[PDB]
Amino acid sequence: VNFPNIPAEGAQFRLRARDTGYVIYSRTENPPLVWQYNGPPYDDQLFTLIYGTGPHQNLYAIKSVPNGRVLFSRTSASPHVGNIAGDGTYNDNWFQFIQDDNDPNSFRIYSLASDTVLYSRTTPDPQFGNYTGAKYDDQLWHFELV
Amino acid sequence: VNFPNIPAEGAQFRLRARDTGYVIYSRTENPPLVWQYNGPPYDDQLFTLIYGTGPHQNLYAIKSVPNGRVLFSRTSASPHVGNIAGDGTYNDNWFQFIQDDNDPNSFRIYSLASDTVLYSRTTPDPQFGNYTGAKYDDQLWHFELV
Numbered sequence A, B: 001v002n003f004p005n006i007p008a009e010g011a012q013f014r015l016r017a018r019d020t021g022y023v024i025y026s027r028t029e030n031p032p033l034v035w036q037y038n039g040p041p042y043d044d045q046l047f048t049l050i051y052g053t054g055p056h057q058n059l060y061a062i063k064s065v066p067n068g069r070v071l072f073s074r075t076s077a078s079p080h081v082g083n084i085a086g087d088g089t090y091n092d093n094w095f096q097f098i099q100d101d102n103d104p105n106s107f108r109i110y111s112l113a114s115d116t117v118l119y120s121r122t123t124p125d126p127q128f129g130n131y132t133g134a135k136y137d138d139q140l141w142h143f144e145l146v
Ligand SMILES: OC[C@H]1O[C@@H](O[C@H]2[C@H](O)[C@@H](O)[C@H](O)O[C@@H]2CO)[C@H](O)[C@@H](O)[C@H]1O
Pocket: A071, A072, A074, A082, A083, A084, A090, A091, A092, A093
Protein backbone atom coordinates (compact mmCIF):
# COMPACT_ATOMS: atom_id res chain seq x y z
CA VAL A 1 0.00 0.00 0.00
CA ASN A 2 1.35 3.43 -0.93
CA PHE A 3 2.11 5.72 2.00
CA PRO A 4 -1.03 7.86 2.42
CA ASN A 5 0.72 11.06 3.56
CA ILE A 6 3.11 11.98 0.76
CA PRO A 7 4.04 15.70 0.77
CA ALA A 8 2.36 17.87 -1.85
CA GLU A 9 4.43 18.37 -4.99
CA GLY A 10 6.96 21.13 -4.32
CA ALA A 11 6.58 21.07 -0.52
CA GLN A 12 9.92 20.81 1.28
CA PHE A 13 10.84 18.20 3.86
CA ARG A 14 13.54 16.17 5.52
CA LEU A 15 13.67 12.38 5.31
CA ARG A 16 14.22 11.08 8.84
CA ALA A 17 14.74 7.43 9.76
CA ARG A 18 12.17 6.29 12.31
CA ASP A 19 14.61 4.43 14.56
CA THR A 20 18.03 6.08 14.27
CA GLY A 21 16.49 9.54 13.88
CA TYR A 22 19.17 10.32 11.29
CA VAL A 23 18.34 12.35 8.18
CA ILE A 24 19.36 11.96 4.54
CA TYR A 25 21.54 14.63 2.98
CA SER A 26 22.31 15.24 -0.69
CA ARG A 27 25.25 17.52 -1.45
CA THR A 28 27.74 18.32 -4.24
CA GLU A 29 31.07 18.26 -2.37
CA ASN A 30 32.90 15.78 -0.09
CA PRO A 31 31.93 12.10 -0.65
CA PRO A 32 29.73 10.43 0.31
CA LEU A 33 27.49 12.92 -1.51
CA VAL A 34 24.37 11.15 -0.22
CA TRP A 35 24.45 9.65 3.28
CA GLN A 36 22.80 9.84 6.67
CA TYR A 37 23.52 12.53 9.24
CA ASN A 38 23.11 13.10 12.96
CA GLY A 39 23.57 16.80 13.58
CA PRO A 40 22.16 20.29 12.97
CA PRO A 41 19.51 21.03 10.31
CA TYR A 42 21.25 22.11 7.09
CA ASP A 43 19.83 22.92 3.65
CA ASP A 44 21.34 19.86 1.94
CA GLN A 45 18.92 17.79 4.04
CA LEU A 46 15.95 19.51 2.34
CA PHE A 47 14.03 17.84 -0.48
CA THR A 48 10.91 18.23 -2.58
CA LEU A 49 9.08 15.62 -4.64
CA ILE A 50 8.62 15.56 -8.38
CA TYR A 51 5.35 13.71 -8.95
CA GLY A 52 5.65 10.94 -11.51
CA THR A 53 3.12 10.92 -14.34
CA GLY A 54 2.25 8.32 -16.99
CA PRO A 55 4.45 5.26 -16.43
CA HIS A 56 5.87 7.05 -13.37
CA GLN A 57 2.44 7.22 -11.72
CA ASN A 58 2.74 6.45 -7.99
CA LEU A 59 6.49 7.07 -8.26
CA TYR A 60 8.42 10.19 -7.24
CA ALA A 61 11.79 11.80 -7.78
CA ILE A 62 13.48 13.22 -4.68
CA LYS A 63 14.97 16.62 -5.50
CA SER A 64 17.50 18.58 -3.43
CA VAL A 65 16.34 22.08 -2.48
CA PRO A 66 19.78 23.78 -2.50
CA ASN A 67 21.39 21.97 -5.46
CA GLY A 68 18.53 20.58 -7.57
CA ARG A 69 20.00 17.10 -7.99
CA VAL A 70 17.73 14.07 -7.65
CA LEU A 71 18.47 10.92 -5.67
CA PHE A 72 19.31 7.60 -7.24
CA SER A 73 19.30 4.09 -5.81
CA ARG A 74 20.95 1.37 -7.88
CA THR A 75 22.88 -1.91 -7.63
CA SER A 76 24.71 -1.64 -10.97
CA ALA A 77 27.66 0.36 -9.59
CA SER A 78 29.06 1.93 -6.41
CA PRO A 79 27.98 4.11 -4.81
CA HIS A 80 24.54 2.46 -4.68
CA VAL A 81 22.92 5.61 -3.38
CA GLY A 82 23.76 9.05 -4.70
CA ASN A 83 22.57 12.05 -6.65
CA ILE A 84 22.54 13.31 -10.23
CA ALA A 85 21.48 16.42 -12.14
CA GLY A 86 18.05 16.66 -13.74
CA ASP A 87 14.46 15.94 -12.85
CA GLY A 88 14.40 12.15 -13.12
CA THR A 89 16.12 11.37 -16.44
CA TYR A 90 17.14 7.91 -15.22
CA ASN A 91 14.90 5.06 -14.14
CA ASP A 92 16.72 4.69 -10.81
CA ASN A 93 15.71 8.29 -9.97
CA TRP A 94 12.16 7.04 -9.32
CA PHE A 95 10.88 5.96 -5.94
CA GLN A 96 7.78 4.40 -4.42
CA PHE A 97 6.83 5.17 -0.83
CA ILE A 98 5.50 1.91 0.55
CA GLN A 99 3.64 2.02 3.86
CA ASP A 100 4.82 -0.44 6.49
CA ASP A 101 2.22 -3.12 7.20
CA ASN A 102 2.68 -2.96 10.99
CA ASP A 103 3.46 0.74 11.51
CA PRO A 104 1.07 2.76 9.29
CA ASN A 105 3.02 5.92 10.13
CA SER A 106 6.24 4.94 8.40
CA PHE A 107 7.28 3.84 4.92
CA ARG A 108 10.07 2.33 2.87
CA ILE A 109 11.82 4.30 0.14
CA TYR A 110 11.62 1.73 -2.65
CA SER A 111 13.31 1.64 -6.04
CA LEU A 112 11.40 -0.18 -8.77
CA ALA A 113 14.53 0.04 -10.93
CA SER A 114 16.80 -1.80 -8.49
CA ASP A 115 14.27 -3.63 -6.25
CA THR A 116 15.92 -2.08 -3.17
CA VAL A 117 14.93 -0.02 -0.15
CA LEU A 118 17.00 2.61 1.68
CA TYR A 119 18.14 1.85 5.22
CA SER A 120 19.64 3.70 8.18
CA ARG A 121 21.41 1.89 11.03
CA THR A 122 24.22 2.51 13.52
CA THR A 123 25.93 -0.82 12.83
CA PRO A 124 27.29 -2.63 10.90
CA ASP A 125 28.94 -0.90 7.93
CA PRO A 126 27.78 0.41 5.60
CA GLN A 127 25.51 2.28 8.02
CA PHE A 128 23.46 3.80 5.18
CA GLY A 129 22.66 2.34 1.75
CA ASN A 130 20.16 0.25 -0.16
CA TYR A 131 19.06 -3.35 0.34
CA THR A 132 17.10 -6.18 -1.26
CA GLY A 133 15.60 -8.57 1.29
CA ALA A 134 13.44 -8.86 4.39
CA LYS A 135 11.48 -5.95 5.91
CA TYR A 136 13.52 -4.58 8.81
CA ASP A 137 12.76 -1.61 11.08
CA ASP A 138 15.95 0.17 9.94
CA GLN A 139 14.28 0.62 6.53
CA LEU A 140 11.51 2.79 7.98
CA TRP A 141 11.29 6.51 7.25
CA HIS A 142 9.25 9.61 7.96
CA PHE A 143 8.61 12.75 5.96
CA GLU A 144 9.35 15.79 8.11
CA LEU A 145 7.78 18.93 6.64
CA VAL A 146 9.82 22.15 6.92
CA VAL B 1 11.63 -8.50 -3.41
CA ASN B 2 10.69 -9.46 -6.96
CA PHE B 3 9.73 -13.09 -7.46
CA PRO B 4 13.01 -14.79 -8.50
CA ASN B 5 11.40 -17.20 -11.01
CA ILE B 6 9.49 -15.10 -13.53
CA PRO B 7 8.88 -17.00 -16.80
CA ALA B 8 11.18 -16.12 -19.72
CA GLU B 9 9.71 -13.55 -22.12
CA GLY B 10 7.45 -15.32 -24.61
CA ALA B 11 7.24 -18.53 -22.54
CA GLN B 12 3.71 -19.76 -21.82
CA PHE B 13 2.07 -20.46 -18.47
CA ARG B 14 -1.07 -20.58 -16.37
CA LEU B 15 -1.56 -18.36 -13.33
CA ARG B 16 -2.73 -20.56 -10.46
CA ALA B 17 -3.79 -19.30 -7.04
CA ARG B 18 -1.90 -20.95 -4.19
CA ASP B 19 -4.82 -21.43 -1.78
CA THR B 20 -7.84 -22.07 -4.04
CA GLY B 21 -5.87 -23.77 -6.81
CA TYR B 22 -8.02 -21.87 -9.33
CA VAL B 23 -6.56 -20.46 -12.55
CA ILE B 24 -7.07 -17.11 -14.26
CA TYR B 25 -8.67 -17.07 -17.70
CA SER B 26 -8.85 -14.26 -20.27
CA ARG B 27 -11.37 -14.61 -23.10
CA THR B 28 -13.31 -12.49 -25.62
CA GLU B 29 -16.91 -13.68 -25.14
CA ASN B 30 -19.24 -14.34 -22.18
CA PRO B 31 -18.58 -11.95 -19.25
CA PRO B 32 -16.75 -12.03 -16.96
CA LEU B 33 -14.00 -11.97 -19.62
CA VAL B 34 -11.30 -12.31 -16.96
CA TRP B 35 -12.08 -14.41 -13.88
CA GLN B 36 -10.96 -17.47 -11.94
CA TYR B 37 -11.78 -21.03 -12.95
CA ASN B 38 -11.91 -24.47 -11.38
CA GLY B 39 -12.01 -27.00 -14.20
CA PRO B 40 -10.19 -28.55 -17.20
CA PRO B 41 -7.27 -26.84 -18.98
CA TYR B 42 -8.37 -24.52 -21.80
CA ASP B 43 -6.26 -22.26 -24.03
CA ASP B 44 -7.79 -19.04 -22.67
CA GLN B 45 -5.94 -19.83 -19.41
CA LEU B 46 -2.61 -19.49 -21.23
CA PHE B 47 -0.52 -16.36 -20.84
CA THR B 48 2.84 -14.98 -21.85
CA LEU B 49 4.75 -11.96 -20.55
CA ILE B 50 5.78 -8.78 -22.29
CA TYR B 51 8.89 -7.68 -20.38
CA GLY B 52 8.70 -4.03 -19.35
CA THR B 53 11.49 -1.82 -20.68
CA GLY B 54 12.68 1.61 -19.45
CA PRO B 55 10.08 3.04 -17.03
CA HIS B 56 8.45 -0.40 -17.12
CA GLN B 57 11.59 -2.15 -15.84
CA ASN B 58 10.59 -4.89 -13.37
CA LEU B 59 7.00 -4.66 -14.61
CA TYR B 60 5.28 -7.00 -17.08
CA ALA B 61 2.20 -7.09 -19.27
CA ILE B 62 0.23 -10.33 -19.10
CA LYS B 63 -0.80 -11.28 -22.63
CA SER B 64 -3.32 -13.95 -23.67
CA VAL B 65 -1.91 -16.70 -25.90
CA PRO B 66 -5.08 -17.40 -27.96
CA ASN B 67 -6.51 -13.86 -28.19
CA GLY B 68 -3.54 -11.53 -27.56
CA ARG B 69 -5.38 -9.20 -25.17
CA VAL B 70 -3.48 -7.97 -22.11
CA LEU B 71 -4.76 -7.92 -18.53
CA PHE B 72 -5.71 -4.79 -16.66
CA SER B 73 -6.16 -4.16 -12.95
CA ARG B 74 -7.73 -0.84 -12.01
CA THR B 75 -10.00 0.91 -9.52
CA SER B 76 -11.16 3.63 -11.93
CA ALA B 77 -14.02 1.66 -13.55
CA SER B 78 -15.95 -1.63 -13.53
CA PRO B 79 -14.85 -4.31 -13.98
CA HIS B 80 -11.69 -3.83 -11.90
CA VAL B 81 -9.94 -6.75 -13.57
CA GLY B 82 -10.28 -7.45 -17.29
CA ASN B 83 -8.58 -7.50 -20.66
CA ILE B 84 -7.89 -5.13 -23.57
CA ALA B 85 -5.92 -4.95 -26.84
CA GLY B 86 -2.75 -2.86 -27.32
CA ASP B 87 0.25 -4.70 -25.79
CA GLY B 88 0.42 -2.49 -22.68
CA THR B 89 -0.84 0.87 -23.94
CA TYR B 90 -2.34 1.69 -20.53
CA ASN B 91 -0.52 2.06 -17.22
CA ASP B 92 -2.87 -0.45 -15.58
CA ASN B 93 -1.63 -3.13 -18.00
CA TRP B 94 1.65 -3.33 -16.06
CA PHE B 95 2.33 -5.71 -13.22
CA GLN B 96 5.02 -6.39 -10.64
CA PHE B 97 5.49 -9.92 -9.33
CA ILE B 98 6.32 -9.47 -5.66
CA GLN B 99 7.59 -12.48 -3.70
CA ASP B 100 5.79 -13.19 -0.44
CA ASP B 101 8.01 -12.48 2.57
CA ASN B 102 7.06 -15.71 4.34
CA ASP B 103 6.36 -18.14 1.49
CA PRO B 104 9.25 -17.76 -0.98
CA ASN B 105 7.42 -19.95 -3.51
CA SER B 106 4.55 -17.56 -4.18
CA PHE B 107 4.05 -13.98 -5.29
CA ARG B 108 1.52 -11.20 -5.51
CA ILE B 109 0.35 -9.81 -8.85
CA TYR B 110 0.72 -6.12 -8.10
CA SER B 111 -0.45 -3.08 -10.07
CA LEU B 112 1.67 0.05 -9.67
CA ALA B 113 -1.08 2.01 -11.46
CA SER B 114 -3.87 1.06 -9.04
CA ASP B 115 -1.82 0.00 -5.96
CA THR B 116 -3.79 -3.29 -5.89
CA VAL B 117 -3.07 -7.02 -5.87
CA LEU B 118 -5.14 -9.79 -7.46
CA TYR B 119 -6.89 -12.22 -5.14
CA SER B 120 -8.68 -15.57 -5.42
CA ARG B 121 -11.09 -16.92 -2.81
CA THR B 122 -14.15 -19.18 -2.58
CA THR B 123 -16.09 -16.62 -0.53
CA PRO B 124 -17.21 -13.88 0.05
CA ASP B 125 -18.22 -12.30 -3.26
CA PRO B 126 -16.59 -11.07 -5.39
CA GLN B 127 -14.57 -14.29 -5.41
CA PHE B 128 -11.92 -12.88 -7.78
CA GLY B 129 -10.73 -9.29 -8.15
CA ASN B 130 -8.21 -6.75 -6.91
CA TYR B 131 -7.54 -5.29 -3.47
CA THR B 132 -5.59 -2.55 -1.70
CA GLY B 133 -4.69 -3.28 1.91
CA ALA B 134 -3.16 -5.85 4.24
CA LYS B 135 -1.43 -9.02 3.15
CA TYR B 136 -3.71 -12.06 2.91
CA ASP B 137 -2.86 -15.53 1.63
CA ASP B 138 -5.61 -15.38 -1.01
CA GLN B 139 -3.38 -12.87 -2.84
CA LEU B 140 -0.73 -15.45 -3.51
CA TRP B 141 -0.04 -16.99 -6.97
CA HIS B 142 2.11 -19.48 -8.83
CA PHE B 143 3.41 -19.53 -12.38
CA GLU B 144 2.55 -22.89 -13.96
CA LEU B 145 4.75 -23.34 -17.02
CA VAL B 146 3.37 -25.27 -19.99
O1 LIG C 1 20.51 8.23 -11.90
C1 LIG C 1 21.87 7.83 -11.75
C2 LIG C 1 22.44 7.37 -13.08
O2 LIG C 1 23.86 7.40 -12.99
C3 LIG C 1 24.51 7.16 -14.24
O3 LIG C 1 25.92 7.15 -14.02
C4 LIG C 1 26.48 8.43 -13.72
C5 LIG C 1 27.26 8.28 -12.41
O4 LIG C 1 26.34 8.21 -11.31
C6 LIG C 1 28.24 9.42 -12.16
O5 LIG C 1 29.11 9.08 -11.07
C7 LIG C 1 29.07 9.68 -13.42
O6 LIG C 1 29.96 10.78 -13.19
O7 LIG C 1 28.18 10.00 -14.49
C8 LIG C 1 27.35 8.91 -14.89
C9 LIG C 1 26.51 9.37 -16.07
O8 LIG C 1 26.39 8.31 -17.02
C10 LIG C 1 24.10 5.80 -14.82
O9 LIG C 1 24.61 5.68 -16.16
C11 LIG C 1 22.59 5.61 -14.82
O10 LIG C 1 22.26 4.27 -15.18
C12 LIG C 1 22.00 5.96 -13.46
O11 LIG C 1 22.48 5.02 -12.47
